[PDB]
Design a protein around this nucleic acid. Structure first.
Ligand SMILES: [Mg+2]
Ligand SMILES: [Mg+2]
Ligand SMILES: [Mg+2]
Ligand SMILES: [Mg+2]
Ligand SMILES: [Mg+2]
Ligand SMILES: [Mg+2]
Ligand SMILES: [Mg+2]
Ligand SMILES: [Mg+2]
Ligand SMILES: [Mg+2]
Ligand SMILES: [Mg+2]
Ligand SMILES: [Mg+2]
Ligand SMILES: [Mg+2]
Ligand SMILES: [Mg+2]
Ligand SMILES: [Mg+2]
Ligand SMILES: [Mg+2]
Ligand SMILES: [Mg+2]
Ligand SMILES: [Mg+2]
Ligand SMILES: [Mg+2]
Ligand SMILES: [Mg+2]
Ligand SMILES: [Mg+2]
Ligand SMILES: [Mg+2]
Ligand SMILES: [Mg+2]
Ligand SMILES: [Mg+2]
Ligand SMILES: [Mg+2]
Ligand SMILES: [Mg+2]
Ligand SMILES: [Mg+2]
Ligand SMILES: [Mg+2]
Ligand SMILES: [Mg+2]
Ligand SMILES: [Mg+2]
Ligand SMILES: [Mg+2]
Ligand SMILES: [Mg+2]
Ligand SMILES: [Mg+2]
Ligand SMILES: [Mg+2]
Ligand SMILES: [Mg+2]
Ligand SMILES: [Mg+2]
Ligand SMILES: [Mg+2]
Ligand SMILES: [Mg+2]
Ligand SMILES: [Mg+2]
Ligand SMILES: [Mg+2]
Ligand SMILES: [Mg+2]
Ligand SMILES: [Mg+2]
Ligand SMILES: [Mg+2]
Ligand SMILES: [Mg+2]
Ligand SMILES: [Mg+2]
Ligand SMILES: [Mg+2]
Ligand SMILES: [Mg+2]
Ligand SMILES: [Mg+2]
Ligand SMILES: [Mg+2]
Lengths: 52, 52, 147, 187, 122, 52, 97
RNA sequence: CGAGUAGGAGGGCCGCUGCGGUGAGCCUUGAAGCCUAGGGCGCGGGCCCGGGUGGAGCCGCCGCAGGUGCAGAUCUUGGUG
RNA sequence: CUCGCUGGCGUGGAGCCGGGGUGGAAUGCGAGUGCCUAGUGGGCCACUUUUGGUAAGCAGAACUGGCGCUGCGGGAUGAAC
RNA sequence: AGACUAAUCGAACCAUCUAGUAGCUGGUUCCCUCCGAAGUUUCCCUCAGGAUAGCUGGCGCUCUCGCCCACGCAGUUUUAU
RNA sequence: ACCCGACCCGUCUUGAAACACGGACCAAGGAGUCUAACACGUGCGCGAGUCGGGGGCUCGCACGAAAGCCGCCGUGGCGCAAUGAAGGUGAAGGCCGGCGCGCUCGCCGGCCGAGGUGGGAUCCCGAGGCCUCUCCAGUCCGCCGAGGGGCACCACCGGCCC
RNA sequence: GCUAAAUACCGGCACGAGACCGAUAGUCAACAAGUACCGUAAGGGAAAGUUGAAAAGAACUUUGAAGAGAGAGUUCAAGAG
């Protein structure tokens, strides 16, 4: 298989990785969960600071 | 929000307006100027096609 | 872009750019790094010399954490401070000197090059190198360790 | 038939630049005018370098340009470098020298104009010295790329000074068989 | 920066027609129809165009003002000519040649002023 | 699903693109060349009041 | 599984495609593989060229520098520069009767 | 100056399908398709034009994106000799 | 002039510095140089030279050309003449 | 008798792992323009395959010829040896 | 209609019209993809720096699963520095003088501060003559022997670090 | 010995979006699909979308017993029965 001058590449793809892949398309949604989680934390409290 | 070349952009981080490739860019006014057309060779307009 | 490819050019041709005679099959010389010592030594040696064997002592639980010292040379030495100070160290005053601290900028060991600024200085560091320490003694400067 | 000769007929020399930069496309339109109409050979060489790619136009660091202008007899000419001029913070003196480049970097523009010098580009360079009269040409370290230390006769044969490809340096990466004498051969 | 406007617009403009043949400029100010540098009329500071007359008879001539740029309402000044097919041939020659106002493209103004009357007279 | 959909772009080049696209919108030749009808319009960039 | 073993048929035609490139010319031949005792003389000989001599040799250069006819005829008629009085007689020439 | 298998590059106003842009584009006064002893263009890929059928949407140019171009695989499925 | 090598010898030999004359067979040509990399890794025939064989449209080579990769005119026809 | 065990036997059937593996067979879809080979070396449990050189392509770069003598090169002679 | 040319296409192959294989006939379907990683090449942005890629700020506005901002979010990645198994150490010389037996020999004080040789595009200085009587005078165009400081880069010498 | 958070969700209950597929594609299933039907069974597992604007789905006349037709009619069209 190897050929003219190139680096020895050992990737870890013998293990059947396609079953176990977390995909980040839920990344904008959680970010809007979490502003609206902190802001839900903002208007519960009272005068006391968030990250208080 | 973008600033001149002389000052900065006083609403962003470190973004001056990006410096230029040409300054004065009138191609015709450059090429008809006295500096160039003193310095040129001569024009050459005869055709001189295939002589039988 | 599947519209800029080599595949989209090679349709209409039979073997698709892999030879009638040799017949691109699956994995002819094995998979990956197969037979490094046996039948690919003219590749492994002459292109990756030294790939096989051992050299040194083992070190267990190697942390990148007790060997941390970012260097600096005496070219960049003035570049930690605003160069306001090197003007006001050149302002004919006396042996008054800026106390340049390389520990603030993150640099622990001061290595050396040649050609350091003539004006006197005080460097505060964790580690020095004796060529660089010969250079700071050249300009009449000082050499202070921080611990 | 004609040739018992071969065919190496078509040269590989670049003729139009692969780049689509409009501002480079106007400097080419200006400079392809000059190089045929002046009986000058400076204007050939700049017109080559506007064509040329970004690998083959390496950036002058600021202190090469100084050290190649203070050479004797050249205090009075104007430097021209086709390509970018960046800044060197190694040095402390900056004289009042003249500079004509594409895209001087921003911290290099201030340290020229602190030193009272004059900057130009090739729309402005053409008016003063159309023939390139009084103009030193320079260029950066074309072999000075990081890559060009990879290129030799082989990476192991009489050691050849090669910098082999490896996933990271250290112990336990390309050291035993070939890089020393006790573990087999010493190249 | 007229050549800057050309090196943007010389392809990828609007009203540019590339069907079966050459490009066509099809631009509101132009004499001939070619997408060219010289027969291009948004770009230049000094442009000459002639048009039909919506009055029904005559030739109207469009010139750019040269006083105020980037002010496209006032940037055009127009004037109609309805004469006897020979004096309207010379008047457009007088207005082009006996100024500096584009001594290039003399004839192309006239040939259109030639052609548009013959479409209009019978 | 794990195709490389999203593309990352440098933050100076994006700001370079906004700087360029705003610069095209100050020339009547370019903006009529996109296809807009500016033939009877008021002078270019055109500032209407903050009362708007 | 019987085959052919070794032939230099069509090897003359491959070698001379690009050609037998002869190295032949370069200057300042490389200085490896040299007898080391000779080199243990010559590096010393170089380092006292700089240090050992300014005043002896440079002034010694200063002392020795202070010690230091018809067919031949028409070409002169029809030459581009040397013939403008050749035209003294066809143009504004003396010939006249 | 022109040969060309294996092969590598380049140009394509060659075609198909989808997306921003533009064509003050196109059409129940007839779009797509399909057929055509009809008229042509291009070296070619393929296209434009007429006529006939059908009856509701479709194509250009600049960019973007392909599950994108068949005579073959004891090709798969369908259909007829 | 240098030398730390050589040594009867201011000698051997290298190295360095300055000065002085371009013209050293014919012939033809524009050369020099770096990167990446496909395909290939079953060969065959012919003049002469050849080894094993009785000999082979056999087996093995050397030198060159060719068939392969290549049509056309001749050999009626044909891979190589 | 290596028979029979749901038309299945020198290890049944069914579904998954599984799109198992293959140096081995067969197929590999648009045109045009340019350039265009190899079956050889060395090593390999190598002999139907690769590795490496050789051969091929592409992309560049550094220069010189445009004006009684050029620079450089070579499957060639000549003159020496 | 006729003259002449004219074996059936793909495929392996030293060679296919082959007494080699697949191909009854039409329509549709149908075969170098995508992710990662490395390498060279090329376009673009910045430049001894670069990068938001993970987070936070914007009002919650269809397109917004977008875009914009941060910078006392530059932690970090890659680069600026190497070499050694490791403890570890870690890259400036050149010029004019001085001190000792001024030696196989090191030190003391100034003054610039990356060496040298051969090649080397471009640029500069150019003797020299060149254009209607003649002198008498400065611009001037072009040719220009020779000379000069010499880029990129290659070949070689010296030096410095481990 | 216990304990929220941020974390995970190709089953289930609602839901909006798509540079997707448009009936040999998409799920196997756009349809009386895990159904017809095969195997005793474990299990295997298909095909099949398109009248018209609206049924106005061709009354009546006429051969044959009727299928099937010629006249007639409805419809823009029966070259949609
Ligand atoms: Mg390989
Ligand atoms: Mg597996
Ligand atoms: Mg092929
Ligand atoms: Mg083979
Ligand atoms: Mg292959
Ligand atoms: Mg390994
Ligand atoms: Mg010929
Ligand atoms: Mg063999
Ligand atoms: Mg050809
Ligand atoms: Mg179309
Ligand atoms: Mg079409
Ligand atoms: Mg698709
Ligand atoms: Mg496909
Ligand atoms: Mg085929
Ligand atoms: Mg078949
Ligand atoms: Mg049958
Ligand atoms: Mg290939
Ligand atoms: Mg090979
Ligand atoms: Mg034989
Ligand atoms: Mg073959
Ligand atoms: Mg050949
Ligand atoms: Mg032949
Ligand atoms: Mg024949
Ligand atoms: Mg015969
Ligand atoms: Mg034959
Ligand atoms: Mg038995
Ligand atoms: Mg049985
Ligand atoms: Mg058995
Ligand atoms: Mg498969
Ligand atoms: Mg599966
Ligand atoms: Mg299988
Ligand atoms: Mg050829
Ligand atoms: Mg073998
Ligand atoms: Mg085979
Ligand atoms: Mg080549
Ligand atoms: Mg065949
Ligand atoms: Mg058979
Ligand atoms: Mg057959
Ligand atoms: Mg058959
Ligand atoms: Mg198909
Ligand atoms: Mg790159
Ligand atoms: Mg950091
Ligand atoms: Mg516990
Ligand atoms: Mg259908
Ligand atoms: Mg199905
Ligand atoms: Mg209906
Ligand atoms: Mg009846
Ligand atoms: Mg109808």
């Amino acid at each position: 298989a190897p050929s003219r001058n190139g680096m020895v590449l050992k990737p870890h793809f013998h293990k059947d990785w396609q079953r176990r892949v977390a995909t980040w398309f839920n990344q904008p949604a959680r970010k809007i969960r979490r502003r609206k989680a902190r802001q839900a934390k903002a208007r519960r409290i009272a005068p006391r600071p968030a990250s208080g | 929000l973008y600033g001149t070349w002389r000052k900065a952009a006083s609403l962003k981080s470190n973004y001056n307006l990006p410096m230029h490739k040409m300054i004065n860019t009138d191609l015709s006014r450059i090429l008809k100027s006295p500096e160039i057309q003193r310095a040129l060779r001569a024009p050459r307009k005869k055709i001189h096609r295939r002589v039988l | 872009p599947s519209r800029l490819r080599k595949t989209r050019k090679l349709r209409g041709h039979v073997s698709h750019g892999h030879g009638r005679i040799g017949k691109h099959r699956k994995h002819p010389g094995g998979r990956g790094n197969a037979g490094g010592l046996h039948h690919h030594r003219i590749n492994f040696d002459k292109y990756h010399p030294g790939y096989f064997g051992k050299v040194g002592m083992k070190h267990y639980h190697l942390k990148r954490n007790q060997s941390f010292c970012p260097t600096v040379n005496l070219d960049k030495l003035w570049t930690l401070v605003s160069e306001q100070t090197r003007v006001n160290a050149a302002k004919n005053k006396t042996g008054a000197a800026p106390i340049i601290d390389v520990v603030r900028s993150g640099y622990y060991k001061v290595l050396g090059k040649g050609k350091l600024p003539k004006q006197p200085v005080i460097v505060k560091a964790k580690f020095f190198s004796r060529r660089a320490e010969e250079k700071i003694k050249s300009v009449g400067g000082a050499c202070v360790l921080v611990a | 038939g004609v040739d018992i000769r071969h065919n190496k007929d078509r040269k590989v020399r670049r003729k139009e630049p692969k780049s689509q930069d409009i501002y480079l496309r106007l400097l080419v339109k200006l400079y392809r005018f000059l190089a045929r109409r002046t009986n000058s050979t400076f204007n050939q060489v700049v017109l080559k370098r506007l064509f040329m790619s970004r690998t083959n136009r390496p950036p002058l660091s600021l202190s090469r340009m100084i050290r190649k202008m203070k050479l004797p007899g050249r205090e009075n000419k104007t430097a021209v470098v086709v390509g970018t001029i960046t800044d060197d913070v190694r040095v402390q003196e900056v004289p009042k020298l003249k500079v004509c480049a594409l895209r001087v970097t921003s911290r290099a523009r201030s340290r020229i104009l602190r030193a009272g010098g004059k900057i130009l580009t090739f729309d402005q360079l053409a008016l003063d010295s159309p023939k390139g009269c009084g103009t030193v040409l320079l260029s950066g370290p074309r072999k000075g790329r990081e890559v060009y230390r990879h290129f030799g006769k082989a990476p192991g044969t009489p050691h050849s000074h090669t910098k082999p490809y490896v996933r990271s340096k250290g112990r336990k990466f390309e050291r035993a068989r070939g890089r020393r004498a006790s573990r087999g051969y010493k190249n | 920066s007229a050549h800057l406007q050309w090196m943007v617009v010389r392809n990828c403009s609007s009203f540019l027609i590339k069907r079966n043949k050459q490009t066509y400029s099809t631009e509101p100010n132009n004499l001939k129809a070619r997408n060219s540098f010289r027969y291009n009329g948004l770009i230049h500071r000094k442009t000459v165009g002639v048009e039909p007359a919506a009055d029904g008879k005559g030739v109207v001539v469009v010139i750019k003002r040269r006083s105020g740029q980037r002010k496209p309402a006032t940037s055009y000044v127009r004037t109609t000519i309805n004469k006897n097919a020979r004096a309207t041939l010379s008047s457009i020659r007088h207005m082009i040649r006996k100024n500096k106002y584009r001594p290039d493209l003399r004839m192309a103004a006239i040939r259109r002023a030639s052609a548009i009357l013959r479409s209009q007279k019978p | 699903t794990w195709r490389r959909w999203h593309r990352r772009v440098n933050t100076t080049q994006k700001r370079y693109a906004i700087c360029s696209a705003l610069a095209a919108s100050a020339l009547p030749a370019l903006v009529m060349s996109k296809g807009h009808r500016i033939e009877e319009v008021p002078e270019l960039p055109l500032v209407v009041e903050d009362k708007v | 599984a019987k085959s052919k073993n070794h032939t230099t048929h069509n090897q003359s035609r491959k070698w001379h495609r690009n050609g037998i490139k002869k190295p032949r010319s370069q200057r300042y031949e490389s200085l490896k593989g040299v007898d080391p005792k000779f080199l243990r003389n010559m590096r010393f000989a170089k380092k006292h060229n700089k240090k050992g001599l300014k005043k002896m040799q440079a002034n010694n250069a200063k002392a020795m520098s202070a010690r230091a006819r018809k067919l031949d005829r028409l070409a002169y008629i029809a030459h581009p520069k040397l013939g403008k009085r050749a035209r003294a007689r066809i143009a504004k020439g003396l010939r006249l009767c």
